[PDB]
Design an enzyme around this catalytic site. Structure first.
Site, PDB file in Angstrom:
ATOM      1  N   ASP A  31       0.759  -1.245   0.000  1.00 34.76           N
ATOM      2  CA  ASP A  31       0.000   0.000   0.000  1.00 34.76           C
ATOM      3  C   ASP A  31       0.798   1.309   0.000  1.00 34.76           C
ATOM      4  O   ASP A  31       0.264   2.394   0.198  1.00 34.76           O
ATOM      5  CB  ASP A  31      -1.376  -0.066   0.913  1.00 34.76           C
ATOM      6  CG  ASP A  31      -1.819   1.299   1.382  1.00 34.76           C
ATOM      7  OD1 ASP A  31      -2.778   1.816   0.790  1.00 34.76           O
ATOM      8  OD2 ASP A  31      -1.300   1.822   2.394  1.00 34.76           O
TER       9      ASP A  31
HETATM   10  N1  LIG Z   1      -4.424   4.813   2.450  1.00 34.25           N
HETATM   11  N2  LIG Z   1      -4.092   4.211   1.251  1.00 34.25           N
HETATM   12  C1  LIG Z   1      -4.978   4.038   0.065  1.00 34.25           C
HETATM   13  C2  LIG Z   1      -4.503   3.420  -1.083  1.00 34.25           C
HETATM   14  C3  LIG Z   1      -5.385   3.353  -2.168  1.00 34.25           C
HETATM   15  C4  LIG Z   1      -6.675   3.884  -2.100  1.00 34.25           C
HETATM   16  N3  LIG Z   1      -7.391   3.835  -3.008  1.00 34.25           N
HETATM   17  O1  LIG Z   1      -6.767   3.189  -4.134  1.00 34.25           O
HETATM   18  O2  LIG Z   1      -8.719   4.385  -2.940  1.00 34.25           O
HETATM   19  C5  LIG Z   1      -7.181   4.509  -0.937  1.00 34.25           C
HETATM   20  C6  LIG Z   1      -6.268   4.560   0.127  1.00 34.25           C
END
Ligand SMILES: *NNc1ccc([N+](=O)[O-])cc1
Ligand code: HEC
Ligand code: HEC
Ligand code: NI
EC number: 1.4.9.-
Lengths: 77, 339, 493
Positions: A31
């Site tokens: 992430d």
């Molecule tokens: N807090 N990380 C995060 C990564 C990706 C998304 N998104 O792709 O909506 C949201 C939050």
């Protein structure tokens, strides 16, 4: 919450909404760009959308090239 | 390179360096790869009604590109900063008209001056796909703040996800609330929370998103599912489980609509009717976005790193992995279509 | 060069000259020394400003003196400059949700601006990071209208450009020549112990100085070093002292012949010590080390301070069995508390000098882990960031003769780590998160994905820190979370 951490838990960066570390990216690198591309945690993770656009130049594959990610503040020397 | 084959099922996903990959769904192997122009970010793509051209929000949320999949040719390009003195960004907000003749995008602009910034009101900009590589706004309307995902219905109407889901006339620019979220004054419940940046072009032909909502710190956390039928305009919502863990994306099986699969740290299979978890699976790592093939015989997990996980939806077990050339998929949305 | 010409040569063009060395934006804000460095740093990173480290230091100094904060305007938010990142902030909700969910609310409180400057700031945020209004505590409201209509006027009211404090400070501000001399110091490093000694401050070019630290820890490890320091706005002391093999940064507030602050490792801000110093020329009793004595006990106690003269009296029940050393800045003696001594605090005194208390205790009732909550972080292992240790101390509590709670101090203890929850047990966090050393120092695991863990996850963990007193075996509990690194780390959190 600690002065050195984020309170925006989506699921968060240094602590999740539940106050633990389980709802976070496993591993965090999974992430990392999801946090970096749209600058979700700009105070901790550098934005590539606007500020540090070439941050992951030497680390397109974060799973293997996470070591190549540098720090961003323009420190003396 | 190789042109796509008629009748064959394919999947497009964008990869970090700046690749657009075509995966042959039958053999679960990369059919071909295209290098995209400029820079990656977010890399979100959607297939045009021609089942041949992919439109991608790229170059750090500030440009839209049309790429011919049979040749990898960049056929279209609309910059979102056509207004003098402003920089326009799109928070995953773009859609293609039913006939594929126009592209819409809400631009959140910021006037950048010598010693200060001024945030300006958002605006929907319409582009004609015939305009090629120098496409400029052919029409623009005012838009409310905090707008993200958008999907054009069959009758040409545009469903806009913002504080509430709006139904917008792309000719007049007038819009009405199609589905209240923020102003959903539902008693006994809180306002729903929606964090969704994956415009799924699912087999069901619907604009769907997951949301969480508290049912009265005493509040009972629940997961819900929202959907706008793109054929009829029929809207629908429903809680399907008590929140025990988080999920980024969720799709209903085209095979059995009563089953909804959510994913993040685990892949969970839920029974809509019973509002019950039927089965969960542990993953090799965090995955962001689910994708079902046409028949619902496979479930792909994308986003995050450079590998797709292929799952058998019935057993809920990983069958194999498709390692993509390059790096991270990040917030990309795996798109399935029949050429 | 001189501050004013650098301001023009380097900032003009983008910043409009408004007359007599004043420019748009720049001359309408007041910040701390690190606040000014951060603004100029953003100019380099975001706007392509070309400036050497030297000219940058020149401008920071100039701007920090001209447009800084009065001492009272930094009251309660100095932890940020002191790099105390485990501080649990206490601001109102509107400020916390709107302005303190990314970085600290203290970063906001350490600035003074008129409403228009607070407004420009709000536009900059939403403009530089468009995703801001789609994030948690933003997507649930009309972020921009609320920020401009409610937050800006509040920020302007709470932290205005002009204040009586700033006015009087510009007139009452001392010069750097009031700092040279000998400074007796006392301090304490978490999970290491007390420290004391003398800091020799001699002058140098302008508002800079040469510094000499002579001293040692309670255990005997030396604390001798040499370095330099600069003084901003007449009180903001920033120095760097190479003590042993580590460069330690000093962030003190020097006021009325007294320096209060923190001294930490340049590269590791969790590894630091509280610092208090008193300038020679004024009789002061700084500290008693240790600040406790068990009833029926023999103990070497040392008094730190300035102008110490006379005979030490440690209160009823405590016996000075022998003054092992008695200089004007350090008096180490041997004491003995009767097994009959009544538990409670004792006003200590050296001659007529009073000021510090000594706790005589019989038994320990309650034990508290300090800090109660903290964040450790994985690092190194090839990464660009260092590990962030967990450092703890067991705070003993008992009761005095009046049945009132008595804070005894930081007592020696045995340290261990246990899973904080069922989840931590399942994932085996105690095995991967790092290692709790006997001295109360937790060393987190290395950075990066860990193939050995489930989902090849990081060496993160949700832990319960257990301290068991050596004096009686009374336990205490703390909470520590070992998390991921952060690559953006400005001078202020
Ligand atoms: N807090 N990380 C995060 C990564 C990706 C998304 N998104 O792709 O909506 C949201 C939050
Ligand atoms: C309430 C509306 C807010 C106030 C007041 C401030 N912020 Fe922020 N902020 C953010 C970043 C990423 C930075 C700097 C970049 C970095 O830290 O590496 C900042 C910086 C500031 C500053 C410094 C200004 C200067 O030096 O000129 C101030 C005074 C400030 N912020 C005030 C990020 C965010 C953020 C997360 C998306 C939010 C919600 C806020 N900041 C909110 C406020
Ligand atoms: C042109 C490329 C610039 C140069 C050279 C300098 N600054 Fe600047 N500055 C610039 C912009 C576009 C902005 C507004 C947006 C923003 O980043 O804040 C600014 C703003 C400032 C501010 C206000 C910061 C705030 O948070 O309110 C300050 C204090 C500032 N700039 C200082 C500054 C100094 C001291 C410079 C000389 C080394 C300087 N700027 C140069 C653009 C440019
Ligand atoms: Ni207790």
């Amino acid at each position: 919450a600690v002065a050195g951490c984020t309170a925006t838990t989506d699921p968060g960066w240094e602590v999740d909404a539940f106050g633990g570390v389980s709802s976070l990216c496993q591993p965090m690198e999974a992430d990392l760009y999801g946090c970096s591309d749209p600058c979700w945690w700009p105070a901790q993770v550098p934005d590539m959308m606007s500020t540090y656009q070439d941050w992951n130049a030497q680390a397109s594959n974060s799973a293997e090239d996470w070591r190549n990610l540098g720090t961003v503040f323009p420190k003396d020397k | 390179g190789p042109a796509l084959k008629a009748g064959h099922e394919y999947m497009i996903v964008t990869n970090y360096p700046n690749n657009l990959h075509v995966v042959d769904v039958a053999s679960d192997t990369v059919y071909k790869s295209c290098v995209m122009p400029d820079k990656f970010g977010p890399g979100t793509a959607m297939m045009a009604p021609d089942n041949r051209t992919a439109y991608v929000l790229n170059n750090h949320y500030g440009d839209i590109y049309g790429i011919d999949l049979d040749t990898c040719k960049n056929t279209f390009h609309a910059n979102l900063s056509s207004v003098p003195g402003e920089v326009g960004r799109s928070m995953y907000s773009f859609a293609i008209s039913p006939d594929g003749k126009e592209v819409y995008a809400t631009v959140n602009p910021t006037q950048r001056l010598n010693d200060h910034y001024v945030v300006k009101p958002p605006r929907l900009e319409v582009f004609s796909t015939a305009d090629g590589l120098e496409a400029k706004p052919v029409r623009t309307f005012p838009m409310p703040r905090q707008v993200y995902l958008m999907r054009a219905a069959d009758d040409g109407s545009l469903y806009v996800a913002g504080p509430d889901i709006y139904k917008m006339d792309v000719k007049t620019g007038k819009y009405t609330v199609a589905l209240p979220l923020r102003n959903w004054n539902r008693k006994g419940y809180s306002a729903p929370d929606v964090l969704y940046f994956w415009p799924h072009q699912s087999p069901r032909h619907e604009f769907s998103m997951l949301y969480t909502i508290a049912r009265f710190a005493t509040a009972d956390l629940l997961y819900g599912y929202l959907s706008v039928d793109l054929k009829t305009g029929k809207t629908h919502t429903q809680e399907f489980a008590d929140l025990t863990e988080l999920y980024f994306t969720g799709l209903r099986s085209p095979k059995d609509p009563n089953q909804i699969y959510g994913v993040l740290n685990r892949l969970a299979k839920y029974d809509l009717k019973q509002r019950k978890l039927i089965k969960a699976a542990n993953l090799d790592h965090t995955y962001y976005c689910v994708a079902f093939d046409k028949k619902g015989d496979k479930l792909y997990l994308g986003g995050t790193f450079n590998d797709l996980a292929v799952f058998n939806p019935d057993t809920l077990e990983k069958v194999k992995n498709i390692k993509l050339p390059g790096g991270d998929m990040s917030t990309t949305t795996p798109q399935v279509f029949i050429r | 060069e001189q501050g004013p010409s650098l301001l023009q040569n380097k900032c003009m063009g983008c910043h409009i000259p408004e007359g007599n060395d004043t420019y748009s934006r720049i001359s309408h804000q007041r910040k701390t020394p690190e606040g000014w460095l951060m603004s100029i740093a953003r100019m380099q990173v975001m706007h392509g400003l070309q400036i050497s480290d030297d000219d940058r230091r020149t401008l920071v100094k100039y701007l920090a003196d001209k447009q800084g904060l009065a001492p009272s305007e930094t009251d309660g938010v100095r932890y940020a400059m002191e790099r105390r990142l485990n501080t649990v902030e206490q601001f109102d909700t509107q400020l916390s949700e709107t302005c303190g969910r990314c970085h600290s609310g203290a970063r906001v409180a350490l600035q003074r601006r008129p409403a228009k400057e607070w407004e420009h700031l709000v536009n900059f945020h939403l403009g530089q990071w468009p995703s801001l209004e789609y994030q948690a505590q933003a997507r649930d409201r009309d972020w921009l209208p609320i920020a401009l209509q409610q937050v800006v006027p509040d920020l302007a009211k709470r932290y205005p450009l002009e204040s009586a404090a700033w006015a009087e400070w510009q007139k009452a501000r001392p010069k750097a020549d009031a700092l040279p001399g000998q400074w007796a110091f006392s301090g304490h490093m978490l999970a290491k112990g007390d420290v004391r000694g003398v800091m020799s401050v001699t002058p140098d070019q302008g508002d800079t100085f040469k510094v000499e630290v002579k001293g040692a820890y309670a255990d005997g490890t030396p604390f001798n070093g040499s370095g330099s320091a600069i003084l901003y706005n007449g009180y903001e002391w920033r120095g760097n002292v190479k003590v042993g093999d580590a460069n330690l940064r000093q962030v003190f507030a020097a006021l009325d012949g007294e320096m209060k602050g923190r001294m930490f490792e340049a590269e590791h801000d969790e590894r630091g010590l509280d610092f208090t110093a008193v300038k020679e020329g004024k009789a002061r009793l700084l500290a008693v080390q240790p600040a406790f004595i068990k009833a029926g006990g023999e103990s070497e106690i040392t008094l730190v301070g300035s102008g110490l003269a006379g005979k030490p009296d440690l209160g009823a029940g405590v016996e000075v069995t022998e003054v092992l050393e008695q200089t004007p800045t350090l008096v180490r003696l041997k004491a003995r508390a009767a097994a009959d001594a009544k538990p409670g605090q004792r006003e200590v005194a050296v001659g007529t000098l009073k000021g510090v208390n000594l706790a005589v205790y019989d038994k320990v009732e309650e034990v508290k882990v300090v800090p109660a909550f903290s964040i450790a972080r994985i690092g190194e292992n090839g990464a660009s960031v260092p590990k962030v240790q967990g450092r703890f101390e067991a705070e003993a509590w008992g009761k005095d003769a009046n049945g009132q709670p008595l804070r005894i101090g930081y007592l020696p203890a045995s340290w261990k780590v246990e899973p904080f929850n069922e989840r931590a047990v399942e994932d085996e966090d105690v095995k991967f998160a790092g290692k709790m050393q006997a001295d109360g120092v937790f060393v987190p695991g290395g950075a990066g994905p860990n193939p050995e863990r489930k989902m090849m996850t990081n060496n993160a963990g949700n832990l319960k820190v257990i301290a068991t007193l050596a004096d009686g075996g009374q336990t205490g509990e703390g909470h520590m979370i070992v998390t991921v690194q952060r690559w953006n780390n400005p001078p202020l959190p």
